[PDB]
Amino acid sequence: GISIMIKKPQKSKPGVFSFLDPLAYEIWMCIVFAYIGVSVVLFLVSRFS
Amino acid sequence: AFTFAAFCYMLTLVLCASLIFFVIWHIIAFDELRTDNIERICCLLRKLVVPEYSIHGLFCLMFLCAAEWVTLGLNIPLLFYHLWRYFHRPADGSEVMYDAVSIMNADILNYCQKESWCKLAFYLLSFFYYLYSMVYTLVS
Amino acid sequence: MFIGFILSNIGHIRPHRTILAFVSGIFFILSGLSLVVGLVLYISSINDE
Ligand SMILES: N#Cc1ccccc1-c1cc(-c2ccccn2)cn(-c2ccccc2)c1=O
Secondary structure, rough: OOOOOOOOOOOOOOOOOOOHOOOOHHHHHHHHHHHHHHHHHHHHHHOOO | OOOOOHHHHHHHHHHHHHHHHHHHHHHHHHHHEEEEEEEEHHHHHHHHHHHHHHHHHHHHHHHHHHHOOOHHHOHHHHHHHHHHHOOOOOOOOOOOOOOOOOOOOOHHHOOOOOOOHHHHHHHHHHHHHHHHHHHHHHOO | OOHHHHHHHHHHOOOOHHHHHHHHHHHHHHHHHHHHHHHHHHHHHHHHH
């Protein structure tokens, strides 16, 4: 029957933010907002009490 | 399941528990003001308030990046109230401002006390709004 | 490098204003940071192809 011919896939050259790829982008967004999260809680804990 | 939006609701239960503690301390400060005092409740209030904005200002940029448009929209009426008290009416001040040099003459003393129960009523409803949509995004 | 050099020689012949030397130092440093981005771009363009 009728089939599809594509080029056989390759090593697929990296982007700019390819170094971020071992962790999903949903992890990196949680890392950034947990960073401000623990920094505000450090500030709340150290200023008051 | 745990997701980034579910973490944006977990991270705002923790900081709205600070926002209610700013306001319990804010209703006691004006009640103890009427009993006695100006220069100390100038200084004790003035240090408190800028954390209360930017923690809520954190929530605006946190639910914007989480794509939570109802939750970002419900923080809008408290946000644009906050821009007015710092860009156009933080009356002259110039130490930080707003609960500063302008105390008695007693007309702002009634305006602050109506605000101080209006902050607590919004924050206690925000706490259960955040606790509901935490359980919503986790279970679903 | 050519901006930072002609602004270093002004700083040698008219030292009554001293700020000629510090700003020419900034052009000497913004130049080398433009080599590194260029040489990273140059090498990474080879390795991609
Ligand atoms: N290779 C590589 C590399 C080196 C340093 C930091 C990150 C990477 C990288 C990691 C990943 C990845 C992905 C999933 C799980 C674990 N790692 C992917 N890539 C990459 C390589 C080619 C094209 C696009 C991304 C990468 O370039």
